Design a binder for this molecule. Sequence first.
Ligand SMILES: C[S@@+](CC[C@H](N)C(=O)[O-])C[C@H]1O[C@@H](n2cnc3c(N)ncnc32)[C@H](O)[C@@H]1O
Ligand SMILES: CSC[C@H]1O[C@@H](n2cnc3c(N)ncnc32)[C@H](O)[C@@H]1O
Ligand code: SF4
Ligand code: SF4
Lengths: 318, 314
Amino acid sequence: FDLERILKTIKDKNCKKVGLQFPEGLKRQAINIAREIEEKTRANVIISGNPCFGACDIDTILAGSVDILFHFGHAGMGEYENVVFIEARSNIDIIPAVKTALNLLKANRIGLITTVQHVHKLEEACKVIKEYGKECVIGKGDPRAIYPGQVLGCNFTAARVDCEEFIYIGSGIFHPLGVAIATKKRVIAADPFLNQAVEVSPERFLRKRGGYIAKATGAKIFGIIVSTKSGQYRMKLAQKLKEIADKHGKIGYIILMDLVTPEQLLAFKADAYVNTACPRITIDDAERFHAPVLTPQEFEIVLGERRWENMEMDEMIQ
Amino acid sequence: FDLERILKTIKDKNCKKVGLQFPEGLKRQAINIAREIEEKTRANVIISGNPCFGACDIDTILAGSVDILFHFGHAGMGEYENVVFIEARSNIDIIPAVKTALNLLKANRIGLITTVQHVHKLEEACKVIKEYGKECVIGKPRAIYPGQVLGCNFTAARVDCEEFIYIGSGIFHPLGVAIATKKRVIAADPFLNQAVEVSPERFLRKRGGYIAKATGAKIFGIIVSTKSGQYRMKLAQKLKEIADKHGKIGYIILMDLVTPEQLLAFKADAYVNTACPRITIDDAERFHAPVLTPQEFEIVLGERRWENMEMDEM
Ligand SMILES: C[S@@+](CC[C@H](N)C(=O)[O-])C[C@H]1O[C@@H](n2cnc3c(N)ncnc32)[C@H](O)[C@@H]1O
Ligand SMILES: CSC[C@H]1O[C@@H](n2cnc3c(N)ncnc32)[C@H](O)[C@@H]1O
Ligand code: SF4
Ligand code: SF4
């Protein structure tokens, strides 16, 4: 990533103190970057040592005690006074993986989505698809993120476009799964780190979640989990869910925490939990919890306030 | 503890929202207590789910969104306007351990110190020591109770006497008293009813090795905790400047929890901990790189003679 701009920014503004925040994969570079900033500018650097899961997870205590917080690795989320997002993009060629998925397309209007690592390469991919003879749309998502076509585990607005199928560019199965479910459209996952392209079927995902719903039908006491992280806090929803719970003869207790981990939930024995924090906790960490952990809408289905056929992906709406 | 004073407090103050914070051993009670408050009052309850290590670790985000935060298991400290502290007094008998410690006494004026759980039983212990024919004194804001010591606070032992009896379990508090005051300390455990003189020579030798391992270090991480009662950023900035004065480099790392996992994420050779002093001592062998107290870091830098090492107090 572009360290020269960071130094120029600091050096132009005569920053007394500078803050650095890294996602877990980038922390190994934190000390090298702080060295570069202290060597080449006059600012003192404070490093954030908490786990950081994304731009939903800004260290606002550190931002409020430094002149500028550089948050690395993610597209911007929200609107912060003195937080500067440093994007950190990937070099990997995605066009070989794009052409691979072209042989699986069964429609002519193709929507393109990807993650922040690859978003600067979508236009290239859009022109390959268009020369192959197809139409290609890239929707706009979070307006506070400079690049369109970007999806998050909690945000599928870049997939709400006039198109027939989607090519998702990236690794991992969660995002194309969520798009498929949120759009009811066919999603082809093109992994550029493998030069392979496969269709994603959400039926297996949907069966597993129906199993957690079924598994919680007998639950009487629910822990409703709230996170204080800057972009994950949904207390208003949590209080509605408590009221819904009580309306159906069940009991919910609101548990407010920072990190949402199986170990901390194990300390409060309830029959099931409802996670209003990061939606990916519910899915990626499902098997690590000692009792069923439900999205807010799955909870509604468990109590009767929503029908199974209306189950939507959990999306971050604070 | 007293549920009835909690409910009375909630109803008289007309609370609509109440917070509960517990240490890890008491968290298994959180749901029962929340249920009791919701059944017997009009308040809605929010339970803090974070780990909580003491009255140094108030959940201030929760406190800021409720009318009253009940904090269980520690004595108060600091001054938070809407935080009520609900102490957990131990009711174990300490007098036999006191009587067992009389035999090891060498002097005539004895100081008494203990942890917060036993602090209401020190008067009785004082009478016993008096009847034995000795003088007994119980020394006196963080450690708000007479005779109470904390891992980060030994002011109750800054009292005029020749010898100390520590009543409680563990060796950190009596070791700390012995290092802070250079007096003889007898530790009297009321659960086992045993008493032994505590001598710091082996502890200091162990701390000396971590200083030795850290003198070779190129890059220090200077740890600051944002916890309400552990935050020492000013100290961190002083340490960073003094290190630089000696041609050594430290970077400040600001975090909430201070764990070996979060520190392994960074490529520093050694760490200076400005947060809870017990982390440095009790979690020592769990860290990949050596963790120092501020005073041990001063020794590594030649700012402080090894002979003048002292306990890290908040
Ligand atoms: C890999 S990151 C999400 C990747 C990226 N943010 C995205 O757009 O999909 C997701 C993981 O972060 C962890 N996580 C997120 N929020 C958390 C929280 N509040 N407490 C503990 N873990 C959290 C969960 O384990 C979850 O599986
Ligand atoms: C509760 S008694 C002191 C212990 O609490 C834990 N502890 C105290 N403060 C912190 C902190 N800020 N982060 C992580 N652990 C802590 C450490 O293990 C210490 O040994
Ligand atoms: S999926 Fe979870 S970790 Fe990723 S941005 Fe959304 S809330 Fe944050
Ligand atoms: S020893 Fe640590 S945990 Fe105990 S009160 Fe002092 S700072 Fe808090």
